[PDB]
Amino acid sequence: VIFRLIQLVVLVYVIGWVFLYEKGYQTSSGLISSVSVKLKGLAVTQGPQVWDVADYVFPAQGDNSFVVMTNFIVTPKQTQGYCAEHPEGGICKEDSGCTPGKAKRKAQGIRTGKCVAFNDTVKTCEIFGWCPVEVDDDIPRPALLREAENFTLFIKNSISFPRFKVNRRNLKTCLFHKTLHPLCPVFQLGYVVQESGQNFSTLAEKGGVVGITIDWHCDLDWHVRHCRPIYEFHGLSPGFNFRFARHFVENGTNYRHLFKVFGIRFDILVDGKAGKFDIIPTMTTIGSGIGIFGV
Amino acid sequence: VIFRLIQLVVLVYVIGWVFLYEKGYQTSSGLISSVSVKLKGLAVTQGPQVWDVADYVFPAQGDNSFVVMTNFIVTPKQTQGYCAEHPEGGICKEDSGCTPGKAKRKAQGIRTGKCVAFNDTVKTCEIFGWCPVEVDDDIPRPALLREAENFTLFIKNSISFPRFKVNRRNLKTCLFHKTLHPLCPVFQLGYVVQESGQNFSTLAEKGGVVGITIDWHCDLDWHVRHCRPIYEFHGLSPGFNFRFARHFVENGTNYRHLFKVFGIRFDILVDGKAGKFDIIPTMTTIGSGIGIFGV
Amino acid sequence: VIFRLIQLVVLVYVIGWVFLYEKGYQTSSGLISSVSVKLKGLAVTQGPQVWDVADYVFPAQGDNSFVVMTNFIVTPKQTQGYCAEHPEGGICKEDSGCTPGKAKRKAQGIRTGKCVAFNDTVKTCEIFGWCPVEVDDDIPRPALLREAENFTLFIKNSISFPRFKVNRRNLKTCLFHKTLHPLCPVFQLGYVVQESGQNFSTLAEKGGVVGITIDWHCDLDWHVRHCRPIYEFHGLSPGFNFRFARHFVENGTNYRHLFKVFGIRFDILVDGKAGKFDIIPTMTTIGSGIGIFGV
Numbered sequence A, B, C: 001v002i003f004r005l006i007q008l009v010v011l012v013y014v015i016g017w018v019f020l021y022e023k024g025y026q027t028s029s030g031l032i033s034s035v036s037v038k039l040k041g042l043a044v045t046q047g048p049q050v051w052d053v054a055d056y057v058f059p060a061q062g063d064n065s066f067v068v069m070t071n072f073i074v075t076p077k078q079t080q081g082y083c084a085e086h087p088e089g090g091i092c093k094e095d096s097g098c099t100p101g102k103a104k105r106k107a108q109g110i111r112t113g114k115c116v117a118f119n120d121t122v123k124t125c126e127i128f129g130w131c132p133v134e135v136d137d138d139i140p141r142p143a144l145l146r147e148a149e150n151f152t153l154f155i156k157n158s159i160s161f162p163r164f165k166v167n168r169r170n171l172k173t174c175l176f177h178k179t180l181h182p183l184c185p186v187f188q189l190g191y192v193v194q195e196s197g198q199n200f201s202t203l204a205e206k207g208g209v210v211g212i213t214i215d216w217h218c219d220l221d222w223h224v225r226h227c228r229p230i231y232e233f234h235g236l237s238p239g240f241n242f243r244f245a246r247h248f249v250e251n252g253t254n255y256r257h258l259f260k261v262f263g264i265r266f267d268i269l270v271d272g273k274a275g276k277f278d279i280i281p282t283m284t285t286i287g288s289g290i291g292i293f294g295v
Ligand SMILES: *[C@@H]1O[C@H](CO)[C@@H](O)[C@H](O)[C@H]1NC(C)=O
Pocket: A087, A088, A091, A119, A121, A122
């Protein structure tokens, strides 16, 4: 009887799909989380120089978005005065071509009606600004902090589902591996960049962005012991760089050390969805099923 | 037949409203995004002083919330010792009125049972703290970094819808305009403050907060080429200021340069809603429609 | 009549539960918020030292996650050179046990094939790094900034519901109390730590994390004057610490002041749910009710 067949197909639709498969009896809720990150590693740059956590992590106190320096270019002992600007901003020969005002595309200062020597043969437009000017860009290759590949990331996380009042936490040697140590919160940087689909050598010489996700997909009808985190690594490359300066005083004069920092930016996002049996969606689904069953 | 009329009105309700208008056949999902911001600009303050990106952007590495300084008040060469406090904290004449302990409403240090001169005629309570004390507030008018009006904001954004596994990115001269260049990720600061409904002159002399929103309202039944971002500027004024210090050492003594920074705070929020046809909501809606159709 | 009874029980289910209790006629929406925080307080540490807001708040400009220092350990005048490492890293007696390379678990530098004296009796492995090495950990007890208990937190908040286009803001003496001053945005630190279920003395000597939540549960069918914020304090302890350095130049040599900062981390999360009567959920619920009523 075709009526019996259509009744059966509608019935199997509701029970087999809405409830068994899509869990129509459940209601989704969000979570609130806190993430803490600790960096373990040392680097040597060549006199010889050593970089500690207080030096290669931005910001110091930590944040969901933080940068780990992998390479840099330093312009030291930079004061404020009159100096020749970069020749890429324009090579001049006579004072007629030096119009006072503002530069563009890399403006290092305010120009002036004067031409001064740059490298004993070319004459560039004189500027007022932070002098001496930032040296022509020559990114070190290989990167200066190439040892960053072996630093470690200890990630602490504590979530809470406000709707169901459920809290969980993600916690003498261990390193994370996808199918060997799946529940080790300590990650090596080279592993994360490889898992994001990125070459750490290139991502160290220019910089890059690596996203980190902690998926707390939990079925609360089960135990809380089975509500575990799942880590996934995302490649969000054109590079990542920023400029920061260390200001100091010598002989009463204020100087600065300009750094152009190439580093890997890590973004940690915690998103999860939990469900629990409710009576409203069950009745809603069965009523819709009865309606379609009849029609 | 009134029964036919009510059948028609119920039917037009479901098809015409739930499905055609509110898209009852779709299911909403969230997104995960990463934002990167670059600042292009130079400023001159008067000896003459020049402010670079490493100097007027807080924090250096960048963040979804960042501040661009537009004005400041600097108390230089500030050491730790015994000095007269601000007369606004209380003008004294005799040691009897100087009770050692703690001040209030602007406490510059711990008091002591002594009165010392402040400006050769008034005698204020002696304190231990960072001396000399912060000079009386006189906000510069017009602002010192009044050239901030013409700086530019290059915004990078990359979103991803976890449910439908859809990723999108928002990307020789271009500046954003609302109905001229609607898809240019480079914004001039004075434009954003005007669009937020704010005067940049006042918002530069005191500070302020400007919110930036990137609405990725995308209908995934269409192409991904039509899933574009939409920028909206919000005015979230009492002002925005904060204090930060540059610490240095001279002759073995630690000093600091206290800055009171007035600047514009930019908050970037990425929120969007995407939909895709599903079978659960369609059946739910039609079942409810059959129920109401009959009753 | 049992049929009348089942009709009555189904009917009371829908009207009494979906609509009256769970507000099935409403539709939930999220919000976008901005938070600003101001710290009022002074501390004295013993020559005598005074800590201002520019010194004990990380970051300076402010952020939803910020740290207020409560205790610290400072290693001053730290240069780069050859020095004996910490004896906890290994006590040696002969050069045979000094293998050049890298240390572990606390690596202070790169070792070398040499043994040098540490405290005139033990000989430790010589390293290159930031010298002199960080002194053995002795956390001050009681904490150095023990006056942090009486600092204040002024919280500004401005929310907006994008769906219903509703904006709200949470705003000569006032301090917050749970059942005395419920709408005072100024919180004392010792109150927040007590409300989180934490001892401020211990949380000051090691550090800790305190979460702050602003629940904007608003029923938009009422007035907006009744859409008020609700503050809740969460205890998210193993402690919280980080390392940061102040770099300075003396006699042409770069030194640094390494700080190990123990402080309380405050996380502010703004989440709320607003509802407004809609026609889609009402019809959906009544259709499901008619379906179940019949079956
Ligand atoms: C001087 O700088 C100019 C910049 O265009 C460059 O072409 C030239 O080769 C430089 N000279 C030397 C000797 O480096």
